[PDB]
Amino acid sequence: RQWEEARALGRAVRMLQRLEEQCVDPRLSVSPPSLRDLLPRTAQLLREVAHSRREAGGGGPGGPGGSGDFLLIYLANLEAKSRQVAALLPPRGRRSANDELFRAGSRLRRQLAKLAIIFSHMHAELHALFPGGKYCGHMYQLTKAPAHTFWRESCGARCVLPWAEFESLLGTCHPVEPGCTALALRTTIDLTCSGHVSIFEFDVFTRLFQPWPTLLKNWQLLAVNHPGYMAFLTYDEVQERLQACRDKPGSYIFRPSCTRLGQWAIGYVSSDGSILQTIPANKPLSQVLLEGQKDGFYLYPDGKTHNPDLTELGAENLYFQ
Amino acid sequence: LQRYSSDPTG
Ligand code: NA
Ligand code: NI
């Protein structure tokens, strides 16, 4: 067994090249995430992976959760996702279509941004686990130590896990309420919508919802139950959303940055009525919103009046840091 | 314009 993976990688690369052709419409995109930057970016990185592994004693061990297993799943998913984009914006292209695909607020536009985000996340994961094509998943270090401790004691050297096993493991540390809560969490953690959670995906989430002792609490209070939290939005979408709230200076919404993974992008309307977006480093989100509230910048989630009191959570988070 | 403005909390 030497050539299956190579064929897989080649199949993917060709498909990315073919999909790049279908993204012929000018209105794409071009602000990050842009499928048009991402596709050839991801293609070349795949070539490097292909090439780095012709000549490989590596990387790492090769049971489930190793590099070979990771790629099997990763490529399968990339292909799946590519088909969805194929179906959305055919054909070669042909003319200039579809007009709805680029109306702010439209459904297709959202379907497209969500796919564009998935591609950004798919590339980010590969770049993190195979920098320059060279696998480091057996050595990768999570940013928050307690997260790191967890991942290595639970998962060992593995870089990737099926959702079910991951949930079970996370559960024995922070209990995950079954049903709609467990589903919401899965949707938040599984950035690639692959059915598996990578050491990278986990790095993103544990950074976003630090500190560790309140991991799920933060996710629950600041994402699931906060009206200012906007799951999986692009920058341009934020700009579009807040257009209505330009009346109410102090209106704000937040989401994960797409280009600085692990970090938040707060979007607020200024005094002037200008829509500004800022990425804070590197505080918990509870600290970020409290200070922005206390300074008059972050007052009205989604342009609405009910701003959850986070006083206790913020205090709790400083205590645990 | 620049994309991501300065943190307004300092
Ligand atoms: Na995934
Ligand atoms: Ni999926």
Side-chain angles (χ1 to χ4, degrees), chain A residues 2-23 25-29 31-91 93 97-293 295-321, chain B:
Chain A
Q2 313 177 348
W3 291 102
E4 268 263 80
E5 187 181 286
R7 289 203 293 269
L9 287 156
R11 193 198 211 283
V13 169
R14 286 195 302 288
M15 181 176 66
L16 272 34
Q17 288 181 198
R18 221 161 41 222
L19 200 62
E20 182 167 4
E21 296 184 324
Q22 278 183 313
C23 302
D25 192 292
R27 289 159 281 168
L28 284 173
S29 188
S31 192
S34 166
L35 285 176
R36 185 165 160 178
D37 305 334
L38 291 163
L39 291 172
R41 180 168 304 124
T42 304
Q44 183 51 47
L45 184 48
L46 282 169
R47 288 186 206 102
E48 305 299 358
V49 170
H51 180 266
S52 170
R53 295 165 73 86
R54 277 143 74 101
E55 63 222 76
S67 51
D69 192 24
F70 174 100
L71 287 165
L72 200 88
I73 297 148
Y74 179 96
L75 293 181
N77 192 38
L78 181 66
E79 183 165 320
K81 291 291 128 73
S82 300
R83 279 146 141 63
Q84 297 192 260
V85 186
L88 255 193
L89 51 102
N98 308 26
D99 196 43
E100 273 293 299
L101 215 46
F102 303 107
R103 199 205 185 274
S106 95
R107 190 212 341 125
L108 287 171
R109 166 89 174 89
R110 180 83 272 258
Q111 247 164 282
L112 197 286
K114 185 210 184 159
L115 283 167
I117 284 174
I118 280 154
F119 278 81
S120 199
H121 292 155
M122 283 187 299
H123 169 268
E125 195 185 36
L126 196 50
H127 175 89
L129 291 179
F130 297 77
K134 192 150 216 161
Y135 179 74
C136 69
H138 65 294
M139 303 182 312
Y140 184 105
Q141 182 180 335
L142 278 91
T143 291
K144 313 259 67 186
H148 187 78
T149 293
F150 167 82
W151 177 274
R152 286 305 179 200
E153 265 159 38
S154 291
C155 311
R158 296 180 277 169
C159 70
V160 63
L161 257 181
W163 173 258
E165 186 180 357
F166 173 80
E167 173 172 322
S168 184
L169 283 171
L170 184 58
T172 61
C173 228
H174 294 296
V176 176
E177 187 179 10
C180 286
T181 290
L183 179 49
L185 185 58
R186 184 177 163 160
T187 290
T188 304
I189 290 171
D190 183 7
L191 305 174
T192 58
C193 193
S194 65
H196 309 243
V197 175
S198 66
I199 184 160
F200 178 75
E201 276 163 334
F202 192 60
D203 199 19
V204 168
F205 181 78
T206 55
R207 284 178 71 174
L208 283 177
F209 299 103
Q210 70 191 275
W212 174 259
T214 50
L215 190 68
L216 258 48
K217 200 166 185 153
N218 300 315
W219 169 69
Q220 181 78 48
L221 269 37
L222 304 183
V224 181
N225 290 120
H226 205 284
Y229 172 75
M230 311 268 111
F232 287 96
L233 281 204
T234 81
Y235 183 100
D236 287 338
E237 281 178 312
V238 156
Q239 292 289 129
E240 287 159 312
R241 216 204 176 91
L242 286 178
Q243 206 80 340
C245 313
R246 283 224 249 151
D247 291 325
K248 277 210 168 93
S251 309
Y252 78 101
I253 44 178
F254 53 92
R255 72 201 169 74
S257 160
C258 295
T259 70
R260 300 185 214 180
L261 289 186
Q263 296 195 253
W264 291 101
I266 314 313
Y268 61 104
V269 170
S270 72
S271 292
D272 181 40
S274 34
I275 301 176
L276 288 186
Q277 299 193 45
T278 185
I279 297 175
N282 191 259
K283 302 176 289 170
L285 187 56
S286 70
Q287 197 185 124
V288 173
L289 297 174
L290 277 176
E291 291 177 5
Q293 164 168 49
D295 297 340
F297 299 109
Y298 310 148
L299 295 173
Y300 313 105
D302 210 13
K304 269 88 152 278
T305 317
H306 168 68
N307 196 45
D309 178 70
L310 297 180
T311 308
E312 245 294 298
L313 189 55
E316 184 166 35
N317 287 345
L318 282 201
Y319 187 86
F320 281 113
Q321 248 184 339
Chain B
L1 285 160
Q2 179 174 356
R3 188 173 182 75
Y4 286 122
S5 46
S6 316
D7 190 26
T9 48

